[model samples]
Target: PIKSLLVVGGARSGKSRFAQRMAEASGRSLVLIATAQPARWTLIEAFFDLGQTLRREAQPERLLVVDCVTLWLSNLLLRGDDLSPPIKDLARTAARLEGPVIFVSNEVGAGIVPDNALARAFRDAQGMCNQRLAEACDAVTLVTAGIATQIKPGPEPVFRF
Candidate 1:
């Protein structure tokens, strides 16, 4: 298993399932850092700050699975936060972590263009952050209908879920 992975796909594309499978296969204690805040009053930085801090505290023994960064970005966008710098910080945090971390983010740009400025901006930021994390990770996989396609350095077989 790789030290880090970035999984991107549309909704219900089996991205989380694939990550769960990998994490389970690793045979380590799993630590989930959910960036998707369900409430509107949540502070995005605090959410990530806690995750980053927890990951550092746990180190290499536990597997950190950040369920999805797309929702996190959407949250910030709705709050009118600056998207680029936070995305860079997130990418940097992932790169600097000492243990295994799997980041799940949506491939939002593949569909129709958004009808509003906020959605469009969020989608744009999702695209940028996906690229950034994919570049930072050891491997990237694009999932579709429960199938995974490795798109990075070393080739892997495309398997159906």
Candidate 2:
């Protein structure tokens, strides 16, 4: 089991790479939970590239990447499915996985407030989702400038829910 891990960072903060290192150092199989949805977002190719890097470092039992959560949210907004079940499921299950499991998500709350209703709604929803999942995490780190700083396991915890 990974004795410690959690990543929180702004965009381009090297969170994925940190996850890759943790997965490598864990000496266990990697299970990556990706929250970036492809349709509304434009990072699918880059996400694929990141996944490839992780794959290179991942052991056979150590690599299972789950993507499209963000896609699901987009779909929910478009298709209007019940949002609670899926979000709750991802948090409940992904929070308790064994071995080294890396969760990937975009930081959606750091920019200007969305001027439109739809945009604002997306930001609000993802922000809440991030907080919920961070609560279930044991260790949380904020990666910035390609450097990682321990947030939860170091001085204090960042998630209380």
TM-score per model over all chains: 0.83, 0.66
Best by lDDT: 1
- Residue 103, candidate 1: how far off, in angstroms? 0.5
**In model 1, where is the ten-residue run with the lowest total lDDT?**
39-48
Each model's total of backbone clashes: 0, 4
Go through the candidates in order and give each one's C-alpha lDDT: 0.77, 0.56
The whole-model C-alpha lDDT of candidate 2 against the native structure comes to 0.56
- Top candidate on TM-score is 1
In model 2, which range of ten residues has the least summed lDDT?
A: 39-48
Q: Candidate 1's residue-wise lDDT over 12-130, tens digit each?
A: 99999998888887877777776666511112233545345534644677787777787777777777788888888877877778788888888888789869987788878889899
